[PDB]
Amino acid sequence: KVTMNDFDYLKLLGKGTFGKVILVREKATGRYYAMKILRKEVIIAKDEVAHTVTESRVLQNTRHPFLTALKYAFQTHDRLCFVMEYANGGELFFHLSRERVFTEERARFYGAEIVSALEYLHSRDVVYRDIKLENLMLDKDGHIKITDFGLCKEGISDGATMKTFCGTPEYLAPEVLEDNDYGRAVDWWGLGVVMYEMMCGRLPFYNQDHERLFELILMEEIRFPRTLSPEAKSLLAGLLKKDPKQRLGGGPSDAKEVMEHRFFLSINWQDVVQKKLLPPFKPQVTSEVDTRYFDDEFTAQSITQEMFEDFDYIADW
C-alpha cells in the first residue's frame, strides 16, 4: 500500500479545472516524479468515473519510450493519485510560445515521435482524443513524452467507433463536431493541428468564442505561409482534411499512411522508437528540482471501494 506520506511535495507543475500536477520526491528512493491529484467528489458529481478509471488502465497497460510511464497509482478517502515519470523539459507549448515557430526539421523530429506513440496506442486499441501542445512534454533528454490519458478510449480496434463529445475545443476534429459517432482518425487531425502550430506559428483555426471556433473548424479552409515547403503543405493539408475517410491516416492502414508521407522520407522509423536520433534541443536543467521549463503562473503557487477497483497499481520497473 502506497500512502500520501511516502512523498515530499515540492512545487506545482500544472493546474487544471479538474486536477493538479505536483513535483514530488519519494522519501525511500530519493527519485523525483510528477503526481497528478484528482478529487473524488468532483469526479463523482460530474459523472466522470469511467474516464478516470480508463486513464489509470491506459497508464497501467502501456509501455512506450514516448508515453509517460506510471510508477504508482493509489487512492485515499477523498483523492485519486497518479505517480508518473517527471518530464523535466516542460510542455511543447512552453517552448513553442517562447520560440514562436520551429524549423521544419525540428517539427519533423517531434512529429515522428508523436506518430510512433500514436501508432503504438492504436495497436493497443486505444484512441487518445486529446493531442495538444499542453499534453506533449519533453523529457530530460529532449524526447517527446505524451501525458494526460484522461480522455482515452479502450477497445477501439480497426474501424471501431466512439460517441463521447470530448477533447479540447481548438483541437476538435470536424467529425466530432457532427452528430453520432467517430473513428480513430481524430488523433491524426490532432497531430495535424500541433504540426501546423509548430511550423506556422499559430493554430489553423481560432476565435475566443466556441460557437465561432466550431464554425471555422467545420467550414473554413486552411491557409499556408508561402515559404512553407511543398512536403509540409502536403502533410498539413492531408492531416487537416475535414473528411476523416480522406484524411492522412484515416484509411484502413492508419499510421502507415502518415509514416509513408514524403514529409517523413528522411525518417527511419526503427531509429525513432529506439531513441537513436539526436534531439534538436536538450533541456538545460541543472537539477531534478529545476522547473525553469514550466510557467511561473504554476510554480510560484503555494501548495498547502468497488467504484475505483481497477485504479490501484505498483510498477514492475
Partner: peptide, 10 residues
C-alpha cells in the same frame, strides 16, 4: 499569443 486550452467531456 494563444492562451492555455482546457479539455471537456459532455
Amino acid at each position: 499569443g494563444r492562451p492555455r486550452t482546457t479539455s471537456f467531456a459532455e
